[PDB]
Curated annotation (Swiss-Prot):
Coiled coil: none
Location relative to the cell: Mitochondrion
UniProt name for this protein: Putative ribosome-binding factor A, mitochondrial
Organism: Homo sapiens (Human)
Gene: RBFA
Family named by the database record: Belongs to the RbfA family.
Spans through the membrane: none
Amino acid sequence: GSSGSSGRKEDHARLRALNGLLYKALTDLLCTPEVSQELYDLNVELSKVSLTPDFSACRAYWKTTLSAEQNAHMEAVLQRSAAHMRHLLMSQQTLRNVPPIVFVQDKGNAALAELDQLLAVADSGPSSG
């Protein structure tokens, strides 16, 4: 989005404050069995959260183990938990519309991936209607 106009310095301050409130509140739900008993027993905790300037999505970053199989198990349950976390945070009176929560591993995009090509061809249809 953001296809026209531009936000003020106070809009960036509002985004940063609201993202900080989402960070504490999401981390508090990871710290309770009220979202999931399994998620609470796995003892997962966030490192940070990032909110889009469009208000379109909330990327939540979680701390990982040495085991990739245990990481995939934690990631699957934490992504399953996200819709219920959104509903639990929707009890706040001031935040009219809680953004969709999406879970992310703590490692950043430090290199551009092995992305595939894209190609297309038009249909050789008849001239007649």
